[PDB]
Design a protein around this ligand. Structure first.
Ligand SMILES: C[S@@+](CC[C@H](N)C(=O)[O-])C[C@H]1O[C@@H](n2cnc3c(N)ncnc32)[C@H](O)[C@@H]1O
Length: 424
């Protein structure tokens, strides 16, 4: 199989973790290293368990030499350091484990500059940059506020690579369904679209991993890393994406600009209804628009004419009105805004959707494959969004705005009330 692997398997045997009782062995798979069943495994059948003596979470670090200095650092920042540190120490408990970890994955955080060019204009790139940058800054501070000031605790130098490595290890290996825990044995299980349950991680302590599917002997055991992540999200978190178009999403960022002459009132309406000065709306392919997006768009586009809706008089129905549409100029404005944003965004890519689809038809490198897939999907969402609002522009007169809704109760054709009035 492999040196480090064979050595790693041994290490788990003597640690009492794995035994000749476990129905699975390590194997080289297209997804790297994975867990191949040694015998017909059944649904919900536990395949392996690990002693909390082997975790690597905010509970292992704090109980370590650097626990004191990291006591004030965010949980992840704390674990990254612990990971890097334990990596160096040629005696650490995670010696053989670290020997197995990949130097890299296909997460966009490791992509070269050429590789990233393949994501030109893509939201995924904007996001990966932000995340890389932010992690960078955050990690430098830890070098000058904890790494250097404590040269006793952090011997060997800590390169920016070491950071991204550890950060990567967190994003693609840590289990969040329980925090951030790392489990040497259950770190090898891979992801599959075949698993549609997402009920595997569980501890009795002891981390117990149960196979959500019946895997016949020889086959690989899988799990569902997350039924809710977009492809953009899997691309950055792990090094892969799915062909499932239902994973393509594009998030829109709305906000009530402070320069808005009705900023104070608008923000008041937004917060009274669960929305901040800045709100993010994730838009998934083939899914209906997220609730609140339209009403918020209408709020953003409001305008002097319909500003009367911001008066204390409607501070109990204003949101309902926002949901039912304000006025034609309001709707026309917001549609114009969204449509221009889509066109502008779409124009930011360096390939046409046809080109991407043709590319997908050949053999693509894992990273190029991710870029192509991601960018095509984003374009599908950008175009679907734009299509939705294009239609809306056409139906711009089918909506019954505020003024109309207000007169839908005049009772012009009632009784000859004057008769009754002249009766006193
Ligand atoms: C939790 S680790 C899995 C263990 C990994 N296979 C190894 O060799 O150690 C997750 C990483 O494995 C790979 N992986 C897992 N599921 C995959 C899939 N369905 N397709 C491609 N790569 C996958 C990715 O690089 C991902 O970031």
């Amino acid at each position: 199989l492999s040196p480090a692997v064979q050595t790693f398997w041994k290490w788990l045997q003597e640690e009492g973790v794995i035994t000749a009782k476990t129905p699975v062995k390590a194997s080289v798979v297209t997804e790297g290293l994975g867990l191949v069943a040694l015998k017909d495994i059944s649904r919900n059948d536990v395949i392996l368990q690990v002693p909390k003596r082997l975790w690597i979470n905010p509970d292992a670090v704090a109980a370590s030499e650097i626990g004191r200095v990291c006591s004030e650092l965010k949980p992840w920042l704390s674990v990254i350091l612990f990971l890097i540190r334990e990596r160096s120490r040629e005696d650490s408990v995670w010696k053989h484990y670290f020997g197995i970890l990949p130097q890299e994955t296909d997460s966009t955080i490791y992509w070269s500059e050429e590789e990233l060019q393949e994501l030109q204009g893509s939201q995924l790139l904007k996001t990966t940059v932000s995340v890389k940058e932010y992690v960078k800054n955050e990690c430098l501070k830890l070098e000058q506020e904890i790494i250097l000031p404590n040269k006793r605790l952090f011997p060997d130098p800590v390169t920016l690579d070491d950071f991204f490595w550890a950060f990567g290890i967190l994003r693609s290996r840590a289990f969040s369904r329980l925090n951030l825990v790392v489990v040497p044995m259950a770190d090898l299980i891979n992801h599959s679209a075949g698993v549609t349950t997402e009920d595997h991680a569980y501890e009795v302590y002891l981390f117990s991993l149960k196979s959500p599917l019946s895997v016949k002997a020889g086959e690989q055991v899988y799990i569902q890393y997350d039924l809710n992540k977009s492809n953009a999200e899997l691309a950055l978190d792990y090094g892969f994406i799915e062909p499932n178009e239902n994973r393509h999403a594009y998030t829109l960022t709305l906000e009530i600009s402070e320069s808005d002459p009705f900023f104070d009132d608008k923000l008041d309406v937004a917060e009274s209804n669960g929305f901040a000065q800045t709100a993010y709306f994730d838009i998934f392919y083939n899914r209906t628009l997220p609730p609140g997006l339209l009403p918020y768009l209408r709020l953003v586009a409001l305008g002097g004419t319909d500003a009367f809706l911001l008066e204390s008089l409607f501070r109990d129905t204003i949101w309902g009105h926002l949901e039912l549409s304000v006025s034609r100029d309001n709707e026309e404005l917001l549609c114009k805004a969204v449509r221009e944003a889509c066109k502008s965004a779409l124009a930011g890519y360096h390939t046409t959707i046809e080109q991407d689809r043709e590319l997908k038809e050949g053999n693509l490198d894992s990273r190029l494959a991710i870029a192509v897939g991601i960018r095509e999907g984003e374009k599908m969402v950008l175009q679907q969004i734009d299509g939705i609002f294009e239609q809306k522009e056409l139906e711009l007169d089918q909506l019954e705005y505020y003024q109309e809704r207000r007169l839908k109760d005049l009772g012009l054709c009632g009784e000859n009330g004057d008769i009754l009035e002249n009766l006193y």
